[PDB]
């Protein structure tokens, strides 16, 4: 029972090359380079599902720090204030209020300064 291996090899190669559309040059044409490109894209994608949590958090902290200094207190003192005021709003939402609702953020700063004093 000789098994020719054309049809299944074609299917594997094609699977990998479909996962590499949009890559520059051989990275999207040649199998032997698109295999490495697809794997290295896999490793980066893993690594960056962790980094997007780190990057979004540092973005939010920069926005709360900006808006809170606009209301006359730093980020450090603001988070200490709200923790002592026993407010448990996470900082995705504090960043989002700090962009969209300036008056609510002003009131949060008043709770923070009220408890912090």
48 near RNA, rule: CB under 7 A: yes
| Per CB under 7 A, 9 contacts RNA | yes
CB contact set of 71 (below 8 Å; sequence gap of 6+): 105, 106, 109
Residue 100 found at the interface with RNA (CB under 7 A): no
Q: Does 18 bind RNA (CB under 7 A)?
A: no
If one asks whether residue 52 binds RNA (CB under 7 A), the answer comes out as yes
With binding defined as CB under 7 A, does residue 36 bind RNA?
Answer: yes
- Comparing CA positions, the residue from 99, 92, 79 lying closest to residue 53 is 92
Percentages of the chain per state (helix, strand, coil), in multiples of 5: 80, 0, 20
Q: Which is nearer to RNA, 52 or 72 (CB)?
A: 52
Residue 89 touching RNA (CB under 7 A): no
Coil, strand or helix at 59: helix
Query: What is the C-alpha separation between 2 and 87, in angstroms, rounded?
Result: 72
Q: Which residues bind RNA (CB under 7 A)?
A: 1-2, 4-6, 9-10, 13, 21-33, 36-37, 39-41, 44-45, 47-49, 51-52, 55
């Amino acid at each position: 029972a000789r098994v020719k291996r054309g049809v299944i090899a074609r299917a594997r190669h094609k699977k990998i090359l479909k996962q590499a559309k949009g890559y520059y040059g051989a990275r999207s044409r040649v199998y032997r380079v698109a295999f490495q490109a697809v794997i290295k894209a896999g490793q980066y994608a893993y690594r960056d599902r962790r980094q997007r949590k780190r990057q979004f958090r540092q973005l939010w902290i920069a926005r709360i720090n900006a808006a809170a200094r606009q209301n006359g207190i730093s980020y450090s003192k603001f988070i200490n204030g709200l923790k002592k005021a026993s407010v448990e709003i996470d900082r995705k939402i504090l960043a989002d209020i700090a962009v969209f609702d300036k008056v609510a953020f002003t009131a949060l700063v008043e709770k923070a300064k009220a408890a912090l004093a």
